[PDB]
Amino acid sequence: VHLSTIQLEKLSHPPARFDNSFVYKWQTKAALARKVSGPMREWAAELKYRTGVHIELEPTYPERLSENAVQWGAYETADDVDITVYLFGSERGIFNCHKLMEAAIQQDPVYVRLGIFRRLANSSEVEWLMLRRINRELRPPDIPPISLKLPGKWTLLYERYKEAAIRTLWEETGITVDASNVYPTGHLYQTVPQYYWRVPVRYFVAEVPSDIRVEGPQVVPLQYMRNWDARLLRQSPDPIDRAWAQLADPATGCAWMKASMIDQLQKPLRGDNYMAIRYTPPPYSNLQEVVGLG
């Protein structure tokens, strides 16, 4: 796959807070600094590949991040959070990186999810392809160790929503879907000031043939659950594990599950209507009836 103005204030001398590179500073809000670092620090890593400059963020007034009620007091939303961006690199680096950021501020970095479903014989219900990605141990305090997810990752710099959903679908399942068969189904943005770095998420759906070859993760494959012990996990007290043993393929790390099961499994850590809120097809797709979410 094919992998208004920002006022930078040059620091004549670097503060010992970080100790012949140049150092530039940008004072802005989390509404904008969210996009220069991106969904998973990935847009920052890409600004690093393209220009070589390193980026670091820090709240300007972290003390306001501890108050509950509202220059002083609690922040109302995560977008009013004051953020200080520091750029480290050559002068041509900060220069080249400066416009890339000025094009990134106008984009909308998001996480993307492609709900892949298949029809069943003797059926009006459908099954969805499910993954279990094991999260890094350097993760915020509200993110569990293992995430039961549908295929999808995040957009790259300059990448549109649906192409990212198509790209990252193949990266985690080896399945190739055509753009004419992907339909947008919704978007969520639920963040709180303390999680000022959270980006929204765009949702899509598509139907694959019932006999489709599910190869599994094609990128970072050891970052997903596979080759588990069938009996060991069958006695786990977590209902998701007990569901993973019964349904998932240990060779690929993928499982086909009904929407009545997904919402039940996701109910503790998400709530009700998990599938219907995210993956309800639009009427023009002739898919609402076959999906069964209405």
Partner RNA sequence: GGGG
Binding site for RNA (CB under 7 A): 37-41, 43-44, 57, 111, 113, 132-136, 138-140, 143-144, 146-150, 153, 188-191, 195, 197-201, 223, 240, 265-266, 268-270, 278
Nearest distance, CB of residue 211 and RNA, angstroms = 26
Nearest distance, CB of residue 98 and RNA, angstroms = 18
Confirm or deny that 202 is annotated as ligand binding. Answer: no
Q: What is the dihedral of CA 276, 279, 280, 282, to 10 degrees?
A: 160
Whole-angstrom distance between the N-terminal and C-terminal Cα of the chain?
A: 34
> Of 65 and 188, which CB lies nearer to RNA in the complex structure?
188
Q: What is the dihedral of CA 259, 280, 35, 99, to 10 degrees?
A: 130
CB 118 within 8 A of CB 63: no
> Of 48 and 121, which CB lies nearer to RNA in the complex structure?
48
Residue 194 DSSP SS3: helix
Contacts of 32 (CB under 8 A, 6+ apart): 83, 105
Confirm or deny that 199 is annotated as ligand binding. Answer: yes
CB 25 within 8 A of CB 120: no
> Of 30 and 126, which CB lies nearer to RNA in the complex structure?
30
Nearest distance, CB of residue 208 and RNA, angstroms = 20
> Of 142 and 178, which CB lies nearer to RNA in the complex structure?
142
Confirm or deny that 161 is annotated as ligand binding. Answer: no
The radius of gyration of the chain from alpha carbons, rounded to an integer in Å, stands at 22
Nearest distance, CB of residue 198 and RNA, angstroms = 4
Q: What is the DSSP string of 13-55?
A: S--TT----EEEEEEEEHHHHHHHH-TTSHHHHHHHHHH--EE
> Of 40 and 105, which CB lies nearer to RNA in the complex structure?
40
- The single-letter DSSP state of residue 60 is S
Distance of CA 156 to the CA centre of its chain: 11
> Of 50 and 139, which CB lies nearer to RNA in the complex structure?
139
Confirm or deny that 192 is annotated as ligand binding. Answer: no
Nearest distance, CB of residue 202 and RNA, angstroms = 8
Nearest distance, CB of residue 54 and RNA, angstroms = 12
List residues forming the annotated binding site: 113, 190, 199, 203, 270, 274, 278
In the annotated binding site for GDP, the residues are: 113, 190, 199, 203, 270, 274, 278
